[PDB]
Amino acid sequence: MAVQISKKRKFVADGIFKAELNEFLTRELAEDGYSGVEVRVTPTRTEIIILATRTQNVLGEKGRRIRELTAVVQKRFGFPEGSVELYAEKVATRGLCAIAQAESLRYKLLGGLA
Amino acid sequence: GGVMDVNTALQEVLKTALIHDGLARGIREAAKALDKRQAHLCVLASNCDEPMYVKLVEALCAEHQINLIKVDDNKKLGEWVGLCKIDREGKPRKVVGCSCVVVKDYGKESQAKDVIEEYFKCKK
Amino acid sequence: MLMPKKNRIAIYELLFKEGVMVAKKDVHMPKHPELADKNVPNLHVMKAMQSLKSRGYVKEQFAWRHFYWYLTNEGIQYLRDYLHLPPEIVPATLRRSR
Amino acid sequence: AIHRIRITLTSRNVKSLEKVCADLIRGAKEKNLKVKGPVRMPTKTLRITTRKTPCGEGSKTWDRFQMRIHKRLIDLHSPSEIVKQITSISIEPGVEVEVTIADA
Amino acid sequence: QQLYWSHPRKFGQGSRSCRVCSNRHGLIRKYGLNMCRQCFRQYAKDIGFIKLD
Amino acid sequence: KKSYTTPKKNKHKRKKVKLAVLKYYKVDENGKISRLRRECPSDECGAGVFMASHFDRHYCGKCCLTYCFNK
């Protein structure tokens, strides 16, 4: 469990994790009104705050979907087991959330409408 | 399950033997199984093939491990096997006779599997 | 083959335990590290999941050279009977998320 | 015992950095741990100078991108317990901290 | 089947691959890139950089 | 880029001839089993399989790089 990479390379690898996730999620939560993330490492724990407008469809019945998502990250980036902890968040004021407004227009259009 | 009748007894083998992975289906695999000491049971069936194996199987049982059973009508044991595992023993996609099977320690040693064989062995 | 009968089990059993599989797009992987431990020298994960996916039973995402296969209810029933498991066992997960 | 314990801060945002340094210098000086001030180290430039045009055609253009990291460190000498207690808490922004056993 | 499928790739432009899909041609290494210059631009907004000059 | 031009040979995979199966064990009297050629001697071989009676060549087919006697 060591040593540790250069300080220059420390920020690049964080950016790669911040970015990859942000396109991983957008290909699954598109219909659930995705709006971004906000990551935070905390003492001996990861927080990944999965911002979307409707937390209902994200959660699922018995929390199945949130359980799938946590198990994915736990294998993919090779995280130490049980350190990963997801959280959800609902945003209030949804018309300043351009990302979600654009992706909502998409499904309105692809639904078949003028 | 069974009452130690010959017909329902060989059915009880195949159920837990599948889980044990003891089934050496086909004459060549049966031979290699029983030429090894892994086997503990041999079952044969009605002639659909040459008159050579009917002799040879008794000859192999003689030298190594005597255990043989003969039950006619190849289609019975042929029906009991799947194409992989459970999910249809009816199955017009494929069904074909085994003509002989050899099982290793007669599958799992547990309930009625033990009794069916012990019933036969002392009288044979 | 297409692949051995040992290496089938080791994928289908591993999927049942985590409830999810992931892998990378390569054809020069030598033993496939990063679970299935050292007994898949080729495609095999990707090749077996694709056939499973054809018949439903799983969903598949793909993003930045990494697959992500999500097991579903229909496949749980299949795999449960296919691997001769108890009529009610899911060791992948089962609790309410708070 | 009393060990020279060094609280290194590192960030990319000058507001987020500096106020979190201030908090640790107040809370230290409040308890009279004989804290030593920030030692601001040279800010380093990551430069990337690459084409602005995919599939090069048209007038030749480029684009300078830059990232500015920042380092600065406050040296304390006090018991390692109360340091490691108070340090890891009271941090709002995404700013890193690295505690060292000894350096001097 | 076969007794070969591969031949030495240990250095050169074929033993490293860029993260578009395993694209090449567009030789890249910088500061730990492994990241394609066309998509680097699309990640100007994403984290790693914000343009300031 | 353009379409394939005619060959004058191509043949893919051999049909791996459809030989009669198990005559490798010989029965003349019971319970005796008259074995022919020796069964394979390696530790990793199970020694329930036969070795090839391939005279002027003597080769275990379970092995695939090793154990080739020839006399």
Curated annotation (Swiss-Prot), chain A:
Describe the PTM. Methylation by PRMT1 is required for import into the nucleolus and for ribosome assembly. Sumoylation by SUMO1 enhances protein stability through increased resistance to proteolysis.
Q: List the GO molecular function terms.
A: class I DNA-(apurinic or apyrimidinic site) endonuclease activity; DNA binding; RNA binding; structural constituent of ribosome
Q: Which stretches make up the KH type-2 domain?
A: 21-92
Q: Which domain of life does the protein's organism represent? A: Eukaryota
Localization (cell): Cytoplasm; Nucleus; Nucleus, Nucleolus; Mitochondrion inner membrane
A GO term (biological process) for this protein? cell division
User: In the record, which positions carry Asymmetric dimethylarginine?
Assistant: R64, R65, R67
User: Where exactly is the Glycyl lysine isopeptide (Lys-Gly) (interchain with G-Cter in ubiquitin) cross-link placed along the chain?
Assistant: K90
Alphabetically list the UniProt keywords. Acetylation, Apoptosis, Cell cycle, Cell division, Cytoplasm, Cytoskeleton, DNA damage, DNA repair, DNA-binding, Isopeptide bond, Lyase, Membrane, Methylation, Mitochondrion, Mitochondrion inner membrane, Mitosis, Nucleus, Phosphoprotein, Ribonucleoprotein, Ribosomal protein, RNA-binding, Transcription, Transcription regulation, Translation regulation, Ubl conjugation
Q: Which residues carry this modification: N-acetylalanine?
A: A2
Q: Which residues carry this modification: N6-acetyllysine?
A: K62
Chief place where the protein resides:
cytoplasm
What's a GO cellular component annotated to this UniProt protein? nucleolus
In the record, the note on similarity to other proteins reads:
Belongs to the universal ribosomal protein uS3 family.
The name on file for this protein is: Small ribosomal subunit protein uS3
The major lineage groups are: Eukaryota, Metazoa, Chordata, Craniata, Vertebrata
Name the gene: RPS3
Q: Which residues of the full protein are shown?
A: 1 to 114 of 243
Swiss-Prot record, chain B:
**Which cellular component, as a GO term, is one annotated location?**
Golgi apparatus
Q: Which GO terms describe its biological process?
A: positive regulation of canonical Wnt signaling pathway; ribosomal small subunit biogenesis; translation
Q: Where is the signal peptide?
A: none
Chain positions found as N6-succinyllysine: K121
> Which keywords does UniProt give here?
Acetylation, Cytoplasm, Nucleus, Ribonucleoprotein, Ribosomal protein
The subcellular location is: Cytoplasm; Nucleus, Nucleolus
Q: Which domain of life does the protein's organism represent?
A: Eukaryota
Instruction: Indicate whether Cytoplasm appears among the record's keywords.
Output: yes
Primary location: cytoplasm
Which GO molecular function terms does the record list?
Answer: structural constituent of ribosome
Which SUPFAM superfamilies does this entry report, sorted A to Z? Answer: L30e-like
Entry function: Part of the small subunit (SSU) processome, first precursor of the small eukaryotic ribosomal subunit. During the assembly of the SSU processome in the nucleolus, many ribosome biogenesis factors, an RNA chaperone and ribosomal proteins associate with the nascent pre-rRNA and work in concert to generate RNA folding, modifications, rearrangements and cleavage as well as targeted degradation of pre-ribosomal RNA by the RNA exosome. Subunit of the 40S ribosomal complex.
Instruction: Give the record's subunit note.
Output: Part of the small subunit (SSU) processome, composed of more than 70 proteins and the RNA chaperone small nucleolar RNA (snoRNA) U3. Subunit of the 40S ribosomal complex.
Return the similarity comment: Belongs to the eukaryotic ribosomal protein eS12 family.
Q: What is this protein called?
A: Small ribosomal subunit protein eS12
- Which organism does this record belong to? Oryctolagus cuniculus
Swiss-Prot record, chain C:
GO MF annotation terms: RNA binding; structural constituent of ribosome
The organism sits in which domain of life? Eukaryota
| A GO CC term assigned to this protein in UniProt | nucleolus
Q: How is it modified after translation?
A: Methylated by PRMT5. Methylation is necessary for its interaction with NPS1, its localization in the granular component (GC) region of the nucleolus, for the proper assembly of ribosomes, protein synthesis and optimal cell proliferation.
Give TM segment ranges.
none
**Which positions form S-S bridges?**
none
* Cellular location(s): Cytoplasm; Nucleus, Nucleolus
Which UniProt keywords are listed?
Cytoplasm, Isopeptide bond, Methylation, Nucleus, Phosphoprotein, Ribonucleoprotein, Ribosomal protein, Ubl conjugation
Say yes or no: keyword Ubl conjugation present.
Answer: yes
In this chain, where does the modification Phosphotyrosine occur?
A: Y12
Record text on subunit structure and interactions: Component of the small ribosomal subunit. The methylated form interacts with NPM1.
**What protein family is recorded?**
Belongs to the eukaryotic ribosomal protein eS10 family.
This molecule's function is given as: Component of the 40S ribosomal subunit. The ribosome is a large ribonucleoprotein complex responsible for the synthesis of proteins in the cell.
Put simply, this protein is called Small ribosomal subunit protein eS10
Give the originating organism.
Oryctolagus cuniculus (Rabbit)
Gene name in the database record: RPS10
Span within the entire protein?
1 to 98 of 165
Swiss-Prot record, chain D:
Please give the GO cellular component terms listed in this UniProt entry: cytosolic ribosome; small ribosomal subunit
Q: Which GO terms describe its molecular function?
A: RNA binding; structural constituent of ribosome
Cross-referenced Gene3D superfamilies: Ribosomal protein S10 domain
Taxonomically, the superkingdom here is Eukaryota
State the organism's lineage. Eukaryota, Metazoa, Chordata, Craniata, Vertebrata
User: Where in the cell does this protein reside?
Assistant: Cytoplasm
N6-acetyllysine: modified positions: K19, K60
Q: Name one Pfam family in it.
A: Ribosomal_S10
- Designated name of the protein: Small ribosomal subunit protein uS10
Q: Which residues carry this modification: Phosphoserine?
A: S78
Q: Which family does it belong to?
A: Belongs to the universal ribosomal protein uS10 family.
- Subunit-level organization: Component of the 40S small ribosomal subunit.
Native source organism of the sequence = Oryctolagus cuniculus (Rabbit)
Q: Which HAMAP family match?
A: Ribosomal_uS10
UniProt key word Acyltransferase: no
Explain the purpose of this protein. Answer: Component of the small ribosomal subunit. The ribosome is a large ribonucleoprotein complex responsible for the synthesis of proteins in the cell.
